[PDB]
Amino acid sequence: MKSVITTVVSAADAAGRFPSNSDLESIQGNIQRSAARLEAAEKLAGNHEAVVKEAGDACFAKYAYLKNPGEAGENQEKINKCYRDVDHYMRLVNYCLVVGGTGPLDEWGIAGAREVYRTLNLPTSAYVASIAYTRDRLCVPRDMSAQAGVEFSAYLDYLINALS
Amino acid sequence: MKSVITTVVSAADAAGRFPSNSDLESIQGNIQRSAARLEAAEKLAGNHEAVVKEAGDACFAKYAYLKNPGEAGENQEKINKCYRDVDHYMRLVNYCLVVGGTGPLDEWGIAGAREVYRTLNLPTSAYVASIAYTRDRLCVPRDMSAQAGVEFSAYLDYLINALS
Amino acid sequence: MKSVITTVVSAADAAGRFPSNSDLESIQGNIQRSAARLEAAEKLAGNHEAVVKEAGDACFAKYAYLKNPGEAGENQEKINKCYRDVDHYMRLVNYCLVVGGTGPLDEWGIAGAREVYRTLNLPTSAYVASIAYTRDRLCVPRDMSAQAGVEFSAYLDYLINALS
Amino acid sequence: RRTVSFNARVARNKSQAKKILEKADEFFARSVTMQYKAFACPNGVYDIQCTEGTVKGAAYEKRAMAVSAAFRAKQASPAAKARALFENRRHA
Amino acid sequence: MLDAFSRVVVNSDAKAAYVGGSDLQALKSFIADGNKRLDAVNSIVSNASCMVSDAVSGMICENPGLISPGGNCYTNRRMAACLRDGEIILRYVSYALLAGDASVLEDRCLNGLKETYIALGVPTNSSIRAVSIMKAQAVAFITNTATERKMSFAAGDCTSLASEVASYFDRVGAAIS
Amino acid sequence: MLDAFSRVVVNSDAKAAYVGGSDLQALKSFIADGNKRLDAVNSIVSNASCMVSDAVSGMICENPGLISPGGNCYTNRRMAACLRDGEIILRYVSYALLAGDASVLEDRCLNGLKETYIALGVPTNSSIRAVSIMKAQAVAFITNTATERKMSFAAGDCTSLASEVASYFDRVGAAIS
Amino acid sequence: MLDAFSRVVVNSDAKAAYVGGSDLQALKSFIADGNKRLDAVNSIVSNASCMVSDAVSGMICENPGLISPGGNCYTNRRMAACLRDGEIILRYVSYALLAGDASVLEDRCLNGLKETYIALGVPTNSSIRAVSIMKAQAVAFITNTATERKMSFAAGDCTSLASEVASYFDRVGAAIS
Amino acid sequence: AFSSIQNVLTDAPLGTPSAMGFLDERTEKPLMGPSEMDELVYAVYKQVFGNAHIMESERAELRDAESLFRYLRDVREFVRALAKSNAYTSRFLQGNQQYRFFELNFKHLLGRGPRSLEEMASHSALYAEGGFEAVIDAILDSDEYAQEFGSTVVPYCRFKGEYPTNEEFNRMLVLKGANSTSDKAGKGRSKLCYSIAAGCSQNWLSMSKALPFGTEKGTGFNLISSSRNPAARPRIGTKIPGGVVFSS
Ligand SMILES: *C(=C)C1=C(C)[C@@H](Cc2[nH]c(/C=C3N=C(/C=C4\NC(=O)[C@H](C)[C@H]4[C@@H](*)C)C(C)=C\3CCC(=O)O)c(CCC(=O)O)c2C)NC1=O
Numbered sequence A, B, C: 001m002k003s004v005i006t007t008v009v010s011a012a013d014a015a016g017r018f019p020s021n022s023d024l025e026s027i028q029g030n031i032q033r034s035a036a037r038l039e040a041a042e043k044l045a046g047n048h049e050a051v052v053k054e055a056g057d058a059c060f061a062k063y064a065y066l067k068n069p070g071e072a073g074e075n076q077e078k079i080n081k082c083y084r085d086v087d088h089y090m091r092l093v094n095y096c097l098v099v100g101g102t103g104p105l106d107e108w109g110i111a112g113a114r115e116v117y118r119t120l121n122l123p124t125s126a127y128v129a130s131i132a133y134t135r136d137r138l139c140v141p142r143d144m145s146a147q148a149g150v151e152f153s154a155y156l157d158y159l160i161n162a163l164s
Numbered sequence D: 001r002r003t004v005s006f007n008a009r010v011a012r013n014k015s016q017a018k019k020i021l022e023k024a025d026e027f028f029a030r031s032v033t034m035q036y037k038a039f040a041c042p043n044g045v046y047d048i049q050c051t052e053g054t055v056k057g058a059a060y061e062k063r064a065m066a067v068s069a070a071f072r073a074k075q076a077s078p079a080a081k082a083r084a085l086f087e088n089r090r091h092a
Numbered sequence E, F, G: 001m002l003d004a005f006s007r008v009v010v011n012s013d014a015k016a017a018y019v020g021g022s023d024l025q026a027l028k029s030f031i032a033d034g035n036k037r038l039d040a041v042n043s044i045v046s047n048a049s050c051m052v053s054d055a056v057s058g059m060i061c062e063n064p065g066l067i068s069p070g071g072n073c074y075t076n077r078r079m080a081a082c083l084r085d086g087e088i089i090l091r092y093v094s095y096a097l098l099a100g101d102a103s104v105l106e107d108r109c110l111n112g113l114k115e116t117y118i119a120l121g122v123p124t125n126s127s128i129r130a131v132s133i134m135k136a137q138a139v140a141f142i143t144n145t146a147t148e149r150k151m152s153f154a155a156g157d158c159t160s161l162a163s164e165v166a167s168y169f170d171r172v173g174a175a176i177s
Numbered sequence H: 001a002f003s004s005i006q007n008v009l010t011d012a013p014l015g016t017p018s019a020m021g022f023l024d025e026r027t028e029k030p031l032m033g034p035s036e037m038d039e040l041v042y043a044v045y046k047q048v049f050g051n052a053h054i055m056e057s058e059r060a061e062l063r064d065a066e067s068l069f070r071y072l073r074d075v076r077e078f079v080r081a082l083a084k085s086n087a088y089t090s091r092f093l094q095g096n097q098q099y100r101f102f103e104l105n106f107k108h109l110l111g112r113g114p115r116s117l118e119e120m121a122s123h124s125a126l127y128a129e130g131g132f133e134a135v136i137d138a139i140l141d142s143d144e145y146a147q148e149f150g151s152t153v154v155p156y157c158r159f160k161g162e163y164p165t166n167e168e169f170n171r172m173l174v175l176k177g178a179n180s181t182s183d184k185a186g187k188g189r190s191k192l193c194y195s196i197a198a199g200c201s202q203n204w205l206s207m208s209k210a211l212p213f214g215t216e217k218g219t220g221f222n223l224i225s226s227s228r229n230p231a232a233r234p235r236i237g238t239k240i241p242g243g244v245v246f247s248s
């Protein structure tokens, strides 16, 4: 799993080395950001079913043709499965804020997803139009902290660059 | 040159990735533990003549047999090469406290030293006794700060361990 | 180039062997079949601008959202690039009838297909909306022979299988 | 990484040859158990001896009791494993 | 590779000198505004998917004979390998903005590149234009003067960080010239 | 290869639970003693070449037939390999103490160690002792109650972290048994 | 590779001759003095660790800029590589003295050595000086005229083995110059 | 066998966690999992293919050898399956000469260059008796591959210090180039071919482009010629007390 602790003890194991002073300096940076990247994950646990309900009904605002037959969401059980695959990502954005790295994003929600979304004829560019709706609707000075904004928006921007 | 920056991007290059949001936390620990390892380094720079004069004759007060015919310090340039080789070592201890990792020690002082000192009959226990003399010469409110003595006496017994 | 002459002499060169009777029995298939697939090579090279005028707008008569601003064909000059890019596929489906294989289709049109359409956000399931119209406009008696309609509709669905 | 503990393609030989001295020993077991049942009921008429069930559909109830009482022969200690080998040999 | 602290060490080891009190006012003033190095390398790699795409697509619109047959990014296998070469160039610049020194850019990227771009027929006069488009886009992300994507920052300047990275894009832009 | 932050999320993907306010108190009680953990890890790795060499030689003086002919630590080739082995075990437990999770020790070191020693004849009755020597020497260097080398610390309580690194030596002595 | 008997039969193979009694009187004296060839090479391999370290440190003595900052015997990293290299050179000239033909020194050790040294930066004038000290201390052990370390031989001249091995040490200087 | 460049100035070699998972009763390996599994696959694709930069529809034909690599975690079996692929013979066999194909097998699968003409001609003796798969499996099932890599690590370019010929280090430095080089830039023709068959050596600037950072890459060149004259007999004399002795 990609974290900030798993890098410095796999780089120590690969050279056969004890954990020296530069490794323990990097754990000290995990204590600094843990007041912001953990506080944003606390906000994305109870208000999660109102940002996932802001996104997908404005995903269909720019993408009107996905309610047409022959495209993806032509019946109601697929739109309710379209609201599942964004609750599957905001649960994974919530996990990688907690562990610090990009581990739950890249090895669960990203790996393999180029080939399922190719074969099953789902457009990736409506996920990009829906994850980025949670970016610009997010403002800092009412909802969350200052450095909780720049950690949450940097993790929405990671899988935007992975899906594109 | 194992540093904190030269390990998190030698792992970002080994998987072909960008600067991750993991690795922007590992330089946030470089901001926190700098002010104990810079202030331990600057104390060593204005006091270095006095600490290697005391460390070098801790070898020769202990080991009087080194002036025998055929031993390590048998003439005056060998005594001058003994005090050079402990002036070199604590210069690298001053370098490791700047870059924050053990990089300048194990590139310039430790790698080769098992093979160099065996061939020239220079004893390892006399090199250890000079460096272990100044490890417990450190007086934690008097000489430097409390946490600044932790950084300075981390690279010292890293060198005592790797030599022994 | 993957065709029947090169595949039997690449495998002969991989084993260090002379061309024996296995190889010569396969180029006899390049005499009995090669009379039929030049009937679609001669048909396509004099007709193609009347094809790609009519093939390309059936994508837009299936997907009219591409001319909206923010999408690909939002101006007239990228409709011309859309009509150009399908004539590359029509010139490469002409070229693969001549050598009788998938040889200049994959290394000139299909290698690098998923990469350059995802960065540019040209959706790959609307490239197949033109060529499935072309596959259903190929009528059996009037356009070409019955065996020529087989080989023309055996390279069209190599491409729409590799585009999904 | 040295010292021939590290090896490959004999490593998939041994997992596909310890079974060849094992499942060609249960072909010995499945057809020497059959050998004395070819003398117990040696014709189509069954004996008084070969009765499993008497009542109640209790043949399933012993089938639940047969397959987990011989599960408790491989579920045995290595001191108890070697007692089953050096002294059942001497009875044979 | 050497970062910005290990550059100062290998200068002083040439003198065999201890790192004194005069060089440490350039390294305490590295870490003083050293939040801003982390607070601006984040605003390259967040937009780095769009940055490589707008780089080479503007390389087409000023040299339109690249997509002619005979041109280098003509077909689909060559347009994909041109797109990932802007990814590798942008990756080793963003290492060097994180490190403070161009040591990892010059040894692991630029060593032997113009030697091999003439060996593959890559037209380097239009590959320079590929670099310098995304040079202009990166220094307006750091300055926060872009039209779209107004990323919220803290108030001050990154006028020296915008020019340190413009020196890094001119190192690759002079290497393949 | 999971650390202690990556244990609470792999207990929560089974429920597909949004990790919120319930289990985040257990990770805020990780970064409370984070500097207490870092002060505890540094004390082992500063004494690690002495911790091994006192342990392996104490195994000889508690079991003097090991250096008889036919013994397992008889010759110089065998004696170097046991010192090599205990330097790996003390390295992997110190990886586990820093991460706070035994999934760096159990996979990279303990997978297949029981079958290797019986294939080489390495007796487990002495290696349960020589692992348990440096188990008791590890809690001396954490709780500062060692006879020599009183290291410099801050005044508080560390008897939870000394018992937590006792449990990693219980994971060693279970697996090699 | 060849030895002193194989060198004769490749000379006769150019003329398709037979190695007869005219050509055999050089080979009948190679076996006649063949005890002294063996008696001379354990005069060298018995003193080979003292011979390398005296020759390398005797080159530092006449050139102290090799151990200043910027010398190519500066750190422990570079000094152990210089000590390894002079042991390799002394190993291959003990093979060549044993065979009686400098084939194996010339293709394995010396072929391509000049290009390694002008790519790594090794000074070749001082490298010739370390070989020329260990040439001079190799003729002292063979003729038993060393100032310490008298070895126990039998009486006679070994003056043609001492100049045969001096020509093997001269090929090392001619190949890196 | 000290080698002052290897774990000092380069990185550490990548690979699987241990070789003790083969002897385990209930596993096959310390199981990595798909974050620390696929970044091992990134270093096998970078090493076996050079920096070829295979596309998504060229990686789609290697799905069967990856899916076996995450079940048997043997690295020797993954390298063997990738060298019999179409993507290995369409890059290194199809448009190249015979000693160009042979000199890249020493680069991609051993991390060294060939030491001899006799070692090189025996690789073409195996081409006559089984084609190119007899060359590839004889490298992989050799003793030199076993006692340097095993099943555990990727076959990397190793600075040994104690090379069996000095010329072996030279051909290793020409074959392995700098970073961001590949194996297609010379148009099919072998780099080391003239120097193997004649017994000469390489060019100093081509070797010193590939040395690691911190190794004085290129100094030491006198401004006269870069190789040796085999026909020259110099006079090298030593001073004794009386005169100068030319022990030639
Ligand atoms: C052989 C006759 C023989 C031994 C060798 C020795 C082995 C042994 N040692 C201990 C106790 C300790 N080891 C410690 C570690 C060190 N001692 C030091 O002074 C330095 C700092 C460091 C490395 C050399 C320490 C501090 C102790 C004392 C107890 C403690 O941990 O504080 C034991 C006891 C283990 C136990 O029974 O709990 C043994 C067996 N003893 C021998 O008999």
Ligand SMILES: *[C@@H](C)[C@H]1/C(=C/C2=NC(=C\c3[nH]c(C[C@H]4NC(=O)C(C=C)=C4C)c(C)c3CCC(=O)O)/C(CCC(=O)O)=C2C)NC(=O)[C@@H]1C
Pocket: C056, C059, C066, C072, C073, C078, C079, C081, C082, C083, C085, C086, C088, C089, C108, C109, C116, C120, C121, C122, C123, C126, C127, E057, E060, E067, E074, E075, E076, E079
């Ligand atoms: C319209 C029906 C499509 C659509 C088309 C667009 N394609 C654009 C650019 C483009 N197309 C190709 C592939 C083409 N070139 C080749 O050489 C070969 C094979 C031999 C093929 C198939 C490339 C490489 C490019 C980019 C380079 C270029 O423009 O020349 C395009 C312009 C996008 C841009 O600005 O780059 C459009 C609009 N887009 C659609 O949405 C529908 C499906």
Ligand SMILES: *[C@@H](C)[C@H]1/C(=C/C2=NC(=C\c3[nH]c(C[C@H]4NC(=O)C(C=C)=C4C)c(C)c3CCC(=O)O)/C(CCC(=O)O)=C2C)NC(=O)[C@@H]1C
Pocket: G047, G050, G051, G054, G055, G057, G058, G059, G060, G061, G062, G132, G133, G136, G137, G140, G141, G145, G146, G147, G148, G149
């Ligand atoms: C190891 C000590 C051997 C041994 C070796 C011999 N050395 C011989 C000659 C010799 N040694 C040196 C180096 C020495 N001189 C210096 O000025 C310095 C320091 C700067 C050192 C270390 C030199 C220069 C020479 C002479 C070579 C020359 O003239 O060019 C030697 C020759 C005869 C002799 O002097 O004994 C031998 C045998 N001597 C020993 O007995 C132990 C076994």
Ligand SMILES: *[C@@H](C)[C@H]1/C(=C/C2=NC(=C\c3[nH]c(C[C@H]4NC(=O)C(C=C)=C4C)c(C)c3CCC(=O)O)/C(CCC(=O)O)=C2C)NC(=O)[C@@H]1C
Pocket: G032, G033, G034, G035, G036, G038, G039, G040, G042, G142, G143, G144, G153, G154, G155, G156, G157, G158
């Ligand atoms: C010149 C280097 C010496 C010196 C040399 C002589 N050595 C003579 C004979 C000799 N040396 C050995 C030992 C040698 N032969 C072996 O087979 C082996 C190892 C397997 C070794 C080390 C032997 C056995 C002999 C032969 C005499 C005997 O058997 O006792 C020798 C006599 C001439 C000859 O018979 O070849 C000479 C002159 N003596 C010197 O004064 C210089 C310093």
Ligand SMILES: *[C@H](C)[C@H]1/C(=C/C2=NC(=C\c3[nH]c(C[C@H]4NC(=O)C(C=C)=C4C)c(C)c3CCC(=O)O)/C(CCC(=O)O)=C2C)NC(=O)[C@@H]1C
Pocket: B059, B066, B072, B073, B078, B079, B081, B082, B083, B085, B086, B088, B089, B108, B109, B116, B120, B122, B123, B126, B127, B130, G057, G060, G067, G074, G075, G076, G079
């Ligand atoms: C004093 C504590 C010792 C002692 C030491 C001697 N050291 C001798 C040489 C020496 N020291 C080093 C390591 C040093 N050089 C470096 O460049 C660096 C790092 C930048 C370090 C730490 C080396 C490599 C050498 C050998 C080369 C040289 O002469 O400079 C030395 C002379 C060796 C000889 O006798 O031939 C001595 C005597 N002497 C003592 O008594 C205690 C053990």
Ligand SMILES: *[C@H](C)[C@H]1/C(=C/C2=NC(=C\c3[nH]c(C[C@H]4NC(=O)C(C=C)=C4C)c(C)c3CCC(=O)O)/C(CCC(=O)O)=C2C)NC(=O)[C@@H]1C
Pocket: D001, D002, D003, D005, F056, F066, F072, F073, F077, F078, F079, F081, F082, F083, F085, F086, F088, F089, F108, F109, F110, F113, F116, F120, F122, F123, F126, F127, F130, H018
């Ligand atoms: C030491 C306190 C023991 C002891 C140890 C011996 N081990 C020997 C060989 C050996 N040990 C291991 C396991 C080691 N390697 C690893 O990679 C890891 C963890 C990841 C560990 C713990 C292996 C794989 C091997 C085989 C490789 C080799 O032989 O070098 C050994 C030598 C056996 C021999 O010479 O045949 C010894 C003596 N023996 C003892 O008495 C104490 C209890």
Ligand SMILES: *[C@H](C)[C@H]1/C(=C/C2=NC(=C\c3[nH]c(C[C@H]4NC(=O)C(C=C)=C4C)c(C)c3CCC(=O)O)/C(CCC(=O)O)=C2C)NC(=O)[C@@H]1C
Pocket: A021, A024, A025, A026, A028, B033, B147, B150, F032, F033, F034, F035, F036, F037, F038, F039, F040, F042, F142, F143, F144, F153, F154, F155, F156, F157, F158
């Ligand atoms: C238990 C083992 C000890 C004890 C431990 C405490 N240590 C405390 C604080 C502390 N330790 C360090 C250095 C540590 N942090 C780092 O970032 C690095 C290396 C990169 C290391 C080695 C620091 C910075 C601190 C914080 C205090 C300060 O800044 O001065 C501590 C205080 C609470 C805490 O912050 O953890 C305790 C209780 N004290 C004991 O009673 C036993 C013997």
Ligand SMILES: *[C@H](C)[C@H]1/C(=C/C2=NC(=C\c3[nH]c(C[C@H]4NC(=O)C(C=C)=C4C)c(C)c3CCC(=O)O)/C(CCC(=O)O)=C2C)NC(=O)[C@@H]1C
Pocket: G056, G066, G072, G073, G077, G078, G079, G081, G082, G083, G085, G086, G088, G089, G108, G109, G113, G116, G120, G122, G123, G126, G127, G130, H003, H004, H005, H006, H159, H160, H161, H162, H163, H164, H165, H166, H169, H214, H215, H216
């Ligand atoms: C010492 C007398 C010299 C000197 C030597 C250095 N050599 C360095 C590296 C090196 N040397 C060789 C040649 C050697 N190895 C062989 O295998 C054979 C023949 C069988 C020979 C003669 C090689 C191949 C290498 C590079 C391989 C490696 O070490 O990994 C070296 C290191 C340079 C550096 O750190 O950048 C040094 C210092 N240098 C001197 O100044 C004296 C004169």
Ligand SMILES: *[C@H](C)[C@H]1/C(=C/C2=NC(=C\c3[nH]c(C[C@H]4NC(=O)C(C=C)=C4C)c(C)c3CCC(=O)O)/C(CCC(=O)O)=C2C)NC(=O)[C@@H]1C
Pocket: H063, H064, H065, H066, H067, H068, H069, H070, H071
């Ligand atoms: C989908 C229909 C199934 C399912 C499939 C999974 N298979 C997984 C791994 C896997 N599959 C195979 C068989 C296939 N791959 C080959 O290379 C060959 C022979 C050429 C065949 C027939 C193998 C050998 C493997 C192991 C290699 C690997 O680990 O990928 C798999 C992943 C499990 C894992 O990561 O351990 C899945 C999910 N599973 C299902 O539930 C549906 C029914």
Ligand SMILES: C=CC1=C(C)[C@@H](Cc2[nH]c(/C=C3N=C(/C=C4\NC(=O)[C@H](C)[C@H]4CC)C(C)=C\3CCC(=O)O)c(CCC(=O)O)c2C)NC1=O
Pocket: A043, A044, A047, A050, A051, A134, A137, A138, A139, A140, A141, A142, A143
């Ligand atoms: C953690 C994830 C998370 C988000 C992405 C946002 C998203 C978000 N916005 C609103 C809802 C709102 N949010 C705002 C705030 C603003 N509108 C603006 O244009 C200003 C820039 C900004 C002031 C800071 C306002 C004014 C509303 C009410 C109007 C609306 O429906 O948007 C709500 C409904 C409940 C609530 O008000 O919190 C949610 C979930 N909030 C979150 O909790």
Ligand SMILES: C=CC1=C(C)[C@@H](Cc2[nH]c(/C=C3N=C(/C=C4\NC(=O)[C@H](C)[C@H]4CC)C(C)=C\3CCC(=O)O)c(CCC(=O)O)c2C)NC1=O
Pocket: B043, B044, B045, B047, B050, B051, B054, B134, B137, B138, B139, B140, B142, B143
């Ligand atoms: C760069 C790092 C650095 C160090 C590690 C120290 C090392 C050091 N200590 C002392 C010197 C001293 N240090 C002390 C202090 C103490 N002695 C004890 O017995 C107690 C343990 C402790 C009190 C807490 C005393 C009393 C002296 C004088 C005794 C002496 O001459 O060593 C001296 C001689 C100069 C002087 O007298 O001040 C030096 C160089 N100084 C440094 O500049």
Ligand SMILES: C=CC1=C(C)[C@@H](Cc2[nH]c(/C=C3N=C(/C=C4\NC(=O)[C@H](C)[C@H]4CC)C(C)=C\3CCC(=O)O)c(CCC(=O)O)c2C)NC1=O
Pocket: E047, E050, E051, E054, E055, E057, E058, E059, E060, E061, E062, E132, E133, E134, E136, E137, E138, E139, E140, E141, E145, E146, E147, E148, E149
């Ligand atoms: C021939 C066809 C053609 C194109 C494809 C575009 C390509 C293009 N875009 C920009 C210009 C730009 N590109 C970006 C980058 C971005 N902008 C955003 O809104 C995103 C956040 C991000 C990725 C898409 C920005 C911000 C500018 C404006 C200049 C700047 O602010 O740096 C430039 C100017 C670079 C320069 O001056 O050298 C060019 C050539 N222009 C063309 O003429």
Ligand SMILES: C=CC1=C(C)[C@@H](Cc2[nH]c(/C=C3N=C(/C=C4\NC(=O)[C@H](C)[C@H]4CC)C(C)=C\3CCC(=O)O)c(CCC(=O)O)c2C)NC1=O
Pocket: A033, A147, A150, B021, B024, B025, B028, E032, E033, E034, E035, E036, E038, E039, E040, E042, E142, E143, E144, E153, E154, E155, E156, E157, E158, E161
């Ligand atoms: C782990 C990831 C990680 C980050 C992303 C950064 C996040 C970050 N940036 C800044 C802080 C800052 N960032 C800026 C930067 C700017 N303001 C502007 O108006 C300019 C446009 C732009 C220049 C590029 C400035 C000026 C400060 C405050 C001064 C300073 O301390 O540098 C701060 C300090 C808080 C503050 O001072 O307000 C933090 C934590 N740090 C991290 O550890």
Ligand SMILES: C=CC1=C(C)[C@@H](Cc2[nH]c(/C=C3N=C(/C=C4\NC(=O)[C@H](C)[C@H]4CC)C(C)=C\3CCC(=O)O)c(CCC(=O)O)c2C)NC1=O
Pocket: E056, E066, E072, E073, E077, E078, E079, E081, E082, E083, E085, E086, E088, E089, E108, E109, E113, E116, E120, E122, E123, E126, E127, E130, H051, H052, H053, H179, H180, H181, H182, H183, H184
């Ligand atoms: C780490 C260092 C490093 C790099 C910098 C890149 C450099 C690089 N690019 C290419 C390969 C290529 N590079 C380009 C690039 C371009 N052509 C153009 O028209 C544009 C001007 C320009 C970029 C947009 C193209 C088109 C190819 C493909 C050539 C081919 O297919 O043979 C190759 C050959 C790879 C191979 O196929 O084997 C290499 C090494 N790769 C690296 O490994």
